[PDB]
Amino acid sequence: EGIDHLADERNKAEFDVEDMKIVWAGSRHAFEVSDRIARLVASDPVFEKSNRARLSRKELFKSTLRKCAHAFKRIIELRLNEEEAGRLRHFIDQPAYVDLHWGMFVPAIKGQGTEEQQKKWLSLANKMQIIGCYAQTELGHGSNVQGLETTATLDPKTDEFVIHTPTQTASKWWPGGLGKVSTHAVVYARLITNGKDYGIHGFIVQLRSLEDHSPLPNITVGDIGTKMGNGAYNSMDNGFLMFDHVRIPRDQMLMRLSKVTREGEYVPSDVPKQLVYGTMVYVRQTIVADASNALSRAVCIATRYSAVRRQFGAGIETQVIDYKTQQNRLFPLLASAYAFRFVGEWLKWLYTDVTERLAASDFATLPEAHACTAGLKSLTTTATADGIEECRKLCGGHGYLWCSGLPELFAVYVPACTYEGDNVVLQLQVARFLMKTVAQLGSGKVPVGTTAYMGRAAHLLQCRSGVQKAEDWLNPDVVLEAFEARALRMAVTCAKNLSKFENQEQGFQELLADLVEAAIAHCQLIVVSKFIAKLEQDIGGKGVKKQLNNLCYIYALYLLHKHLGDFLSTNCITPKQASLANDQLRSLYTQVRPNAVALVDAFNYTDHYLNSVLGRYDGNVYPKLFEEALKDPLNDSVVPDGYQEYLRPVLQQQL
Amino acid sequence: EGIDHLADERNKAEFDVEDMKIVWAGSRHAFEVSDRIARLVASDPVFEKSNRARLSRKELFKSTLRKCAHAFKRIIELRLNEEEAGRLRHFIDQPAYVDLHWGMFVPAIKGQGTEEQQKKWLSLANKMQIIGCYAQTELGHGSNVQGLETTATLDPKTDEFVIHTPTQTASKWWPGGLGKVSTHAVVYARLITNGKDYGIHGFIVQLRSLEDHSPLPNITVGDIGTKMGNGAYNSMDNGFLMFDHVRIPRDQMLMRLSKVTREGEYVPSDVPKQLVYGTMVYVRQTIVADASNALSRAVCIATRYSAVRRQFGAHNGGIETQVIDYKTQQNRLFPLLASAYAFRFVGEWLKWLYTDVTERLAASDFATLPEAHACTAGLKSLTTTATADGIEECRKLCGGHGYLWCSGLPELFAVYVPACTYEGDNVVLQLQVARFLMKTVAQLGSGKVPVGTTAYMGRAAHLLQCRSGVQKAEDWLNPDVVLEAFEARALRMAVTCAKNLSKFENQEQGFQELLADLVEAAIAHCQLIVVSKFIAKLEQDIGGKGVKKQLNNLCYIYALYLLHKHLGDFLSTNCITPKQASLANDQLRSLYTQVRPNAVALVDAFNYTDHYLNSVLGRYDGNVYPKLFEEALKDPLNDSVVPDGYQEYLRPVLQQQL
């Protein structure tokens, strides 16, 4: 019928959801564009995906190709701009070769290719005259790109590069859109010329004929197999690729940063390689933004279902969302979704700054921008992945059904923790940055940026919190001092133990676990500080900033409790004060409780996008669960196929 | 071919693996029977399951019926006993109706049926002349069984029970084997007679005809839909069931503890009601035991792959370091390896408890019933939660390749996770433990002292006011130092919750307000139990060169890991100082370095066949990369280099013909 059975929950909102929608979107323009394209996608039959778990691999892949072709057509017929086109693909919500073509193939050519190469290849790529992928990872090397085995040797006699896969472990493995779609690809391999290896470089290589799509000579290509989850990435043709002395023109090597003349000499271009932040600053900011998007979808579903599902506490039973355990599990995730959203905005400013930095030839803040962004990507993706699975558990047994929308969300998102850098490896980079920074404590150098709080090491290392009552934990200065002292203490303790070993790189390895935790503490401090900073801005809407303030401190006090041991080790926070922080946290859960549903409605997700029976906008769950069950292929017949051969003989006692 | 790439790793072992295998199995008999049946399943083509993710729902279900039928045949042709049959189904490793028939339907009739009911129905069930399922859960009620809406009203004039589904939410939902297989089922509904509701009772109801499998009159049954993961529980026909005033003979009501005369009189039997909890203590015991099974599988895979995978740390010109050498990898994996053994041993203890409770229960001795229930519920919650998270963490430990279905980890996680919800929601179960702990605290050792697993709660004297004597890292390897720390931490948290409760006018209101705190205290109590049982295990005589030593390493890794993970809880007691906490961390680090060379052998002790593990990354011989390529070729998407859909959806795009 469409009647909203959560209207009573929404009426509890102490703020206008419409205003919060703008805050979440980031601006009115962003909201309007996304909302329009979203409705557009939802109203198009070709983009349906509620039966995505009832199709075979082949059928799922073909259906994906169809959606992509249809999307391209709609973009042209509707004359959608870049922004709208990007939102269209976003709401189609189905991993496809197109994501890598536009997301890695093109960008790789723009930043690593010469102007002429860009003119030629970008012209073909932008008009879909060719389809490319990013072939970097191999069977034996993913995170350690410097260890790639694929080789590219120049042939002075033919002025061509010989691309070869020395061993089976040198085979490309994982590239999206490589398995069956891409006609071309940017292949990364060891550059070899004049009998010398000059490291990893990118080379454009045609994989398939543009006439029959058949693999070119000496090219071995295919899909790597089924991946985790029903649907999810299985719509993507992640593939492998091997070269048997494949030849490509010399000028097919991306030569913006370095080039190889006809003579075969390697010549590092005069371009500042420090401008390679197009693959590790903006890209990671989108990853951090994607985390808020993924987490918000999961929290939206779990919040609505928690307000619908009643169990125990009876006549009528209590809504599970009323239970403090449900809140202590769900509300921190709702706070994290907003926290990551805002930290994602700050990362947009950092990009505009780092870009502003590579202008005046200032590379003084690059080291911090690298570790900061790397640590944030690791922190948010990890927290988001865990939160999505937790949201599934918060839905009890029904969350185990695919139609709940949670199982596939986790499966499709989890790769974020590995691609573009293993989460642990990335945090080790932050640990190295923090150790190099602490090594400056007492040197006289004034640390700036996210490490500026290290200048107050004198006070932070010997502090004592002035907290005397629960409400004191709502003071930004009190919370910030707590997190800074915690992070500093942890980093200083690591540095001190690191000087207790003879070999520096040895002690580092021996303490990797402690180093990662110190790095995480630093990253959480950053997220907490950016949420507080966001609250200083002018946010319109009655009661809006009050709810954001509630979420800000729920996030901070939740992490305080989760990592209580770190704070208590610093002795700048006592157990009594920790207990008071816990009382404040509980009080914050109660204040947010009535605003819960409206806070996820602010995400403005359509039922089509959420693709969840439990998280339906109208709260009409149970009837929809039954409706979906009937659609399962196992219900195509009353008596199962296999009854006569494998059941009746048993029941009838005939073996 | 036949080379063992992990040969060197296995030579690093500082203990004899063959002896550790016996420890894991529990005995030489258990080990022998399992090893034999395991090989028997692996060698049978009908039991292939590495292609499971390439089957449609229908083909997967049909294949499941085939495997179960073949199992019945093999048990008869091989003349296998009950133990062997159980091990057979265990290694077939495929969720199916058979699990509920033997695991729930039968146990229900045995513990709730009358002597006359048991020999009539169990004779049918044991011979499989009927196939039953456990139909309790409904759309609207799972954890809260007392809230079930299905009704069973007696009809004196016909001597029948009228089973009915009041509303859509009253529909049975989730029962394994109900969807398409079961012909009968034990249905739970509110017993209605003489115009009174007497609560939830069990009733036997026939769902399908034994001649053509057609649903009986007024019976609406079907499958509830596709579940999380490729394969996994999708071979199981979990279903829904609605009754439109279905009628069954009055004698089809399980009447061992409750009778209903021909005149509709509700009369309790002479059998103690508590003589039913004996089965749940069993089912929960099997769940805990299952936790070690699933966790060890995941850890075996991640441990072997961690020894094969090399990344970064290149020394000898290109020779990169095995990831298992990195402390972060060890800190994430070794605690799970330690937990696998910890859960195995706590599972052994829970078995002993099952018997003990069952014995005394047969003598109307319900003195330890309250404790038995708390431990079981809490351990079921603790182990399943830790195992589920541990399995997913093992997948992340395998980096990118762990995302491939052929790594064996994605399906293992999906098939295992239901463990955190079935038999009671994990958080709900821990709240029951909290209530038990609060009552125990309420009884201040004045009336009858705390014994069993709560005995420590009696020594609140020095506990709530201790100061560990730890002065050196090595001190954290002392059992009394560890136990004292965990007992104090748990008792302290519980006593604090009790005090905070006492300051509320309405005790139930306070309980609800502090739910989160109560669950944390209950978890600390359950962890103490696991730690204490592992330490107790080491007090036994365990033969084998270096065997006990390695178990000792794991024992303290488990304890010290939890101490670190929940550091905040211990530092609040003032019985542990930050300096002593830092010493525990140093000891933990050292234990990792000691376990490192023993890692691969410690997972080989599980004695899993490659067929059972069904993992390319975790292959016994470590021949990962070549096998990954081999598996990729089997995907249907590789049936052709040019994908179907190319002509319609790719060519037109590449030619600007949209």
Ligand SMILES: Cc1cc2nc3c(=O)[nH]c(=O)nc-3n(C[C@H](O)[C@H](O)[C@H](O)COP(=O)(O)OP(=O)(O)OC[C@H]3O[C@@H](n4cnc5c(N)ncnc54)[C@H](O)[C@@H]3O)c2cc1C
């Ligand atoms: C769905 C998906 C899509 C992808 N798409 C593409 C693509 O389009 N193009 C492309 O080129 N690639 C792609 N990739 C590959 C991806 O970008 C990464 O290169 C790859 O996932 C890195 O993981 P790995 O297997 O190398 O992990 P590893 O780096 O081998 O790590 C494995 C384990 O060892 C640990 N470890 C490793 N090194 C260290 C260290 N130094 N210290 C401590 N611990 C360490 C890790 O933490 C982890 O526990 C994709 C991957 C996935 C899963």
Ligand SMILES: Cc1cc2nc3c(=O)[nH]c(=O)nc-3n(C[C@H](O)[C@H](O)[C@H](O)COP(=O)(O)OP(=O)(O)OC[C@H]3O[C@@H](n4cnc5c(N)ncnc54)[C@H](O)[C@@H]3O)c2cc1C
């Ligand atoms: C794969 C699978 C197979 C199953 N097979 C069977 C079967 O064969 N037969 C059968 O009868 N059933 C079966 N079940 C059902 C199962 O045994 C449980 O009854 C059911 O999964 C419990 O989940 P729920 O939906 O009731 O969760 P709920 O109990 O409703 O909980 C949902 C959320 O609310 C929270 N919550 C609920 N109550 C409280 C409370 N009092 N205090 C604080 N928080 C609370 C929970 O923590 C959770 O976060 C199966 C379930 C699954 C997933």
Ligand SMILES: [Ca+2]
């Ligand atoms: Ca309502």
Ligand SMILES: [Cl-]
């Ligand atoms: Cl799934």
Ligand SMILES: [Cl-]
């Ligand atoms: Cl899966």
Ligand SMILES: [Pt+2]
């Ligand atoms: Pt050039």
Ligand SMILES: [Pt+2]
């Ligand atoms: Pt960078």
Ligand SMILES: [Pt+2]
């Ligand atoms: Pt309705």
Ligand SMILES: [Pt+2]
């Ligand atoms: Pt080999």
Ligand SMILES: [Pt+2]
């Ligand atoms: Pt009877």
Ligand SMILES: [Pt+2]
């Ligand atoms: Pt019980």
